[model samples]
Target: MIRINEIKLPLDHEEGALLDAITKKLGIPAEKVISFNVFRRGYDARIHLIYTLDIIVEGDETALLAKFANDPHVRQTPDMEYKFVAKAPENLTERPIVIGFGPCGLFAGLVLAQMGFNPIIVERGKEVRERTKDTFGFWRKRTLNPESNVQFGEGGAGTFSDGKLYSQVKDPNFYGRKVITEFVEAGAPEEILYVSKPHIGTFKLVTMIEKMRATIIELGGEIRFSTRVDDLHMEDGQITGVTLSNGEEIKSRHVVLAVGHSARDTFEMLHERGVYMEAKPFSVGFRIEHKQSMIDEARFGPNAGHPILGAADYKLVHHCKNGRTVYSFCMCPGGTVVAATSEEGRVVTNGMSQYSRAERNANSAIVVGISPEVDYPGDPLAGIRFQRELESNAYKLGGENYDAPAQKIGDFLKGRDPSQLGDVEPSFTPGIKLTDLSKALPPFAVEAIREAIPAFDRKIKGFASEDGLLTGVETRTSSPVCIKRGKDFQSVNLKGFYPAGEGAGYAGGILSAGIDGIKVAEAVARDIVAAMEN
Candidate 1:
């Protein structure tokens, strides 16, 4: 297998043009290439240029990669690499425990299963498919299912999101590619394979997760749904086993704690047990919604209605008047806002879509940065408590129900009740009750978002439009604490305990979280095997 990087093409250039460019870059006939894949697809530019690609050229041409890197049109050339090493664990285990079945746990357990290490995947919530039903039931029917909401369950928070796979981290093993490949194989749209920014809607994500789960089972991995971890048995600073909420003790020297960001209680439990943790800076704010057509117009201009141009998404950031940086997180185009509450009385909202990103409104969290030093002070768990307060407030503002508190952009700007929505109706489920979101959010956050909107509008053209809807409490941006890991990425106090994924505060989203999972799985696989040998 061979890979090529940075082949430039005209903006309207078809994919065949990319093939021609690759052939020219490699100085070989097009037929000589067995296959090729776009490393980064071109978007929103006059040139439909390729950032890079992985190609299986007929012969080993190590020098050719460098040759293309020198090309003028090439913006940047990333090293295209793959693992020739099988890197399998020495021993297979029937009872390796994975604490959560989110992206991290799913991929971690999937990889272990692929390597013939049948592991047990545990989730406090229901499976992915059921989770979807419950999530929709909440958004549409004004009901909240605590155990099977958006933020819990098999796929993690990413499951209910736009399913955006683009990440800032450059995955060396094409692990990012592997993630997309797995999703594509699991009935995700093929477009996700080549798009510059691909997303799987909620409908597709549910089915795909189910299929992935079945594959894991077929690969001999054991999966337990609705099994919450009650306690970790640690002796002499090493994990011996875990006790379930139902009082069943499972002995496994290796445990991957992938329990997602919404597992606040679990995080508190870990802290009480003296699992090393520290407050990490994260963001808080509201889910802002705009008319999908408005977003398309704002982004694409005249090209808004182009068949290929979907609901245009934007990543905007602004340094606000309150000295906090406000940014857009999890921009879900043509999607719906679902109840992301993992607890009983809290009203939290997040965005969700199916494979088609085809909805009426586009939504994303316009969040302001919240640092531990400024807000949380000495308590590492203080951020979690802060989030709880806001969520609790949102619950009250929603009339003690799951209905989300919402303020129109104009009203939110003026510090008043959002009585009328102009052009864009909110996509949030359980529905949005027009109210003063100021009471639900901290004054600092509210002020930051208010100041940041106009600043964002400068970038996205109409992002701060008066008609845009602001649904309160998009608080579950990421984990509030980092369960400190030592040099080898294992918990310092518990030798055999691996603090992995979002809940552990090692990751922020699906791709990074999954990558973290594989990384820890690799680390722990070697450790467990080494222990066996000794």
Candidate 2:
């Protein structure tokens, strides 16, 4: 198949525009082109409404390749099929183990099981369905399930997020394709395969995760949910087994530590077991919410309500004079700021959207970056301490309820207290309490974010509008520590302990985490196969 890039069309172009564009690019008659399909669809509304599509055309490829040799847009479709590295022998008994049933562990176990390894996966949280119920229950009744909420669940934190499938991770081996393909097979919308920024959203993600879990189980993989790994059994700097919370010990030579960023207890356990790791820099800030219509109008102008544009989103970064970088994160258009804290008596916020993205508010994190070397300085788990402090402070500011501390943009910029809700009402729940947000984060972070709001407003007009709401606090930007690993994908000190996913600081989002899982799975499988051969 021939792939063509940079094909532009009007927002409401005729149905045959794509066909015409393909034939024109191929320099052939319409009859010469058999068919064409969009591979990627992106929009450029800088001047006028236009659609940019990367499409695959089924026509004379040999002639087209030579004809458009000088043009980079025309080329042969690259192979993206996923390939397994090794298969388990029939006599193989010691199955590899995966900890945490998040995206990383999900794919790690899936790949290993596909390679005939029959991997065992253990998660501290409940299954996807039960997890959803627990998560919604928190949002509705203000109940906190330490192990089963948004952060620790069958699908990991990403399950409750925007379910964003796109990532900036470099993938020459097309592992991302493998991930998207698996999601598609497990019940994601087919449009996710072609949309520029594909997302399954919250509802679709829950069902898709359940389907993927079933697939893993059907392939001989054992998924034991509500089974927390309490301790690690290492022998001579190599993992031998893990001790679960129930005091059940499971033996495994190779262990994938794919626990997500919220696994504070797990991180402490690993540290106690002499795991080599280091503190890393992470961002802390509040979730900012604005009227979705306002954002759409600001971003698209004359093309405000264009269906293709969806609810418009923005990415803003402003380096403050305080030597801090503030940027927008996890921008969820037409979404709600969620209560994401797993521990009791602390409040943390994240953003989530449904598949339709029909919510009234668009929320994103406005965070100030901080480093351990400069901020926490020393202990690897100091970042976690810092996060807890902010979360605890926010909880108090919200009157000790699950309610989040909130402020109107105008009040925050003016450093005054919020008297009441504004035009842009907050979507956070159990709810948001209007208050002064200046003390919600650290002084430096507060100053930095204060400087960032107006700067962001200049970029997107009315962004710092008086009624725009700021909800605190979004502490879990990423993992607070990085588990040291060598080129072989195992811990530098622990030979059989493979640290993977966001918890290990190896991946950020769903696609990247899934990709990391596949790469690590290949390494694990190849090593197991090599060991058997030797």
Candidate 3:
């Protein structure tokens, strides 16, 4: 199979256009091109309604390879098939433990089970369905379940997010394709395997997670939910077991700490236990929302409502004079700003969308990057403290309720209070309270974002529209600290404790987290096999 790149065609092109283009690009005769398939389909709506496609063509001829030599547009199809490194032994006695059933933990457990390891996964929250109920109840009734809501739940924070499957992670092994393939097998839309920027959204994610969980169990894996790990048991600088919240201890030789970024208590416990770690930089910001139509019109112009274009999304970044860079994070087209707090009397904001992405508004985290060395120095856990401070402030600003502190973009930029909403209504549920956003974030962050929004408006006209909403506070950008690990994928000093995923400061999103999980699981399997040999 030959993979051809950069094949372009009109939106309403002839049915045989693709095939003709395929043969023409390959410089092969019509009959010589046996078959072809679109590997990916994306549109270039910046100008014409042209489709940019990456396609795989089945054809003959060593002639084509030699003719297109050194041309990146024509190449041999790369094998994306996932291959397991080590399988569990027949006499295997020890089972590895995966902490936190988020993307990292879920994939770690899944891949470990697939390799016949019968791994055990421990989640600090309920299963996906129960977790969904808790999460929705919180948005509806102003109730918060500390362990089962957005951040700590079975499917992880991504469950409540845009469910974005694409990431900026480096993937030399094509593990990302494996992650997408597994998702499709477990009930995700088959389009996710080929779409350039695929997303599963909230509801789809819940059911798919259940399917994946069942597959793990079917393959001899054990998943324990609502089972919090209170402490790590270590002897001679190696993990021996874990102490649960209910005074139960589970023994394990190898452990993967695949906790999510919002696992603050877990971070504190690890720090107190003298785990080698250091504070890392993260971002702080608010959820910005605009009418989906406005974003689409601005982004696509005459091509705004084209079905191929879908709801338009934007990514904006600006380096401010104050030395902070403000960029859009988790851009959710046709999404809602959700109250994503897992603690009491504190509020954190995040964005979510359904599979159809049929919401009225487009939302994203317009965040200013911050560093622990400059922004929240001192203790390694000071970044968490900084986040807590901002979240608590947002809670108070929102009248001590679960409603998010909100301000009109116009008001925010002008440093004034928003007395009324504009054309774009805030889509945050459990609601939004209008206020002065300058008080919501720190002075530097406020200035940085203030500068970036207008600059972004230049890129996407009316991005700083007065009626557009800005909801605070979105502090859970990434992990606050990194649990240092060696090349073996275990802790730098602790031999058997593997720190993986976003909580460990290794991954930023679902795709990268799952990829890290597979790598960590592979490391665990190789280590276990070596231990058995010893």
Candidate 4:
């Protein structure tokens, strides 16, 4: 098989155009072309469809490769298949424990189960179905379930987000491909395998998560919902087990910590247990909303509503004079701003979209980067405290009943109070309170965002539209602390304790988190098998 790069085609190209282009590129007869697979499909800024395809031909592949030796565009296809590291023995000695059932824990437990480890996954929140009801109840009735909301639930924070599966992580081992393949097998859309910016959205993610859960269970894994790990049982810098909230102890030498970014309680517990960790930089800001049509027109121009293009998304960055860098995080095209708070008396925001991405508004987190060195300046947990302060302030500004405070982009820029709704209505629920957003964040952050918005307008016309809404505040860009781990993927100070995924500061999105989970699972499997051989 041969891989071809930079196969460009018009957005509206004919059905057989790809085949024709491939045959012409290879200088081969059409009949000699066996078949082709689109390994990746993306578009250029000018809206042309660009593809990286793997093709199988009838002729000798080595001779064809020799002929195209000077062609950088043609090369041998590298194998990207996933292979198991170590299989569990017929008689398992000890079962591994996985804490948190988000993307990281899910994959960690899944892979461990597939290896015959029979991991016990403990999640603080209910399963996806019950968790969805609790989440919607909070959005609709203003009832906050501290444990089962968007952040702490079975599927984790990604479950309630845009569910974007793409990431910028370096995957030399092709662990990301394994994550995507598992997602596809567990009911994710097949197109996610090849689409450039694939997303599962919230609704589709619920069913897909359920299917994955069933697969894990069928593979000899056990999942415990509403079961929170309250305390760790360690001996001489080695993890032995965990104590659950129900006063039950599950003993295991190997444990995977994938509690996710929003688990403040779990972080606190880990801190109290004296596990090595340190403060890390994360971004903070508000969810900015604009009309999806406006964004499409600005990005695609004449190709605004092309079915192939779908909704257009943008990424903008501006370095401020204050040395703060403001940028777009989690850009959700044709999506709605969502209330993403897990703690009571806090108003944190995030964005969400469906598989169709047919919403009226385009929303994203316009954030300013902050670091422990300058922003918090002390304690590994200071960043978490800083986030709490912003979230609490936002709750007060939003009328203290779960509503989010919002202001028009114009009003925010001009430092005036927002008086009326704009063309871009706020999509946040249990609702939004029109107010001055300048009071929502730190002064430096506010100044940075003010400068960044107009700068971003230079990139996307109408980006600073007066009527565009800004919902405050979005604090959970990533984990505020890094659970320091060694090259072996275990806690630097504790044996048998593996720290994996977003909460551990090793990954960001679903794809990367799942990838990290796989790597950690492999490490755990090898250690378990090694112990057996000894």
Ranking by TM-score: 4, 2, 3, 1
Backbone clashes under 3 angstroms, per model: 10, 0, 0, 0
Instruction: State each model's CA lDDT, in order.
Output: 0.78, 0.87, 0.86, 0.91
Per-residue accuracy of model 3 over 267-368 as CA lDDT, tens digit each: 899988999988898898999988898888888777777666667888889999999999999999898898899999999999899888889999999998
Residue 61 accuracy (lDDT) in model 3: 52
TM-score of 4: 0.97
lDDT of 4 by residue, 1-534 (tens): 999989999889999798988988999888988998888889877657898889999869989999999999999999888889989977676899999989999999999999889999999999888898999999999999998998887788889877898766577788988998898898898878888889888888989899999999999999999999999998999999999999999999999999988888888989998999999999999999999999999888888888878889999999999899999989999998988899999999999998889999999999998888787766989999999999999999999989999999998999889578967888999999999998998889999999999999999999999999999799999999999998988999999999999999999889888888999999999988888885
Instruction: Give stretches of model 3 more than 4 Å off.
Output: 14-16, 24-35, 45-72
TM-score of 3: 0.95
Quote the lDDT for 221 in model 3. Answer: 98
Compare the candidates by lDDT and give the number of the best one. 4
lDDT of 2 by residue, 1-534 (tens): 677777777778878888788777777777766666667777665732333344444555676688788988877877767888889977687989999988999899999989889999999999888888898999899999999998998888888878877566567788888998899899999878778788888889988999999898999999999999999998898789999999999999999999988999998988888999899889999999889988888888777776776778889999999889999999998999999999988999998998888899989999988888677756899999888888888999998989999999888889778478867877998998888998888889999999999998899988889889999799998899999787899999998899999999999899999988998999999899888884
Q: What TM-score would every model get versus the actual structure?
A: 0.91, 0.96, 0.95, 0.97
RMSD of 3: 2.2
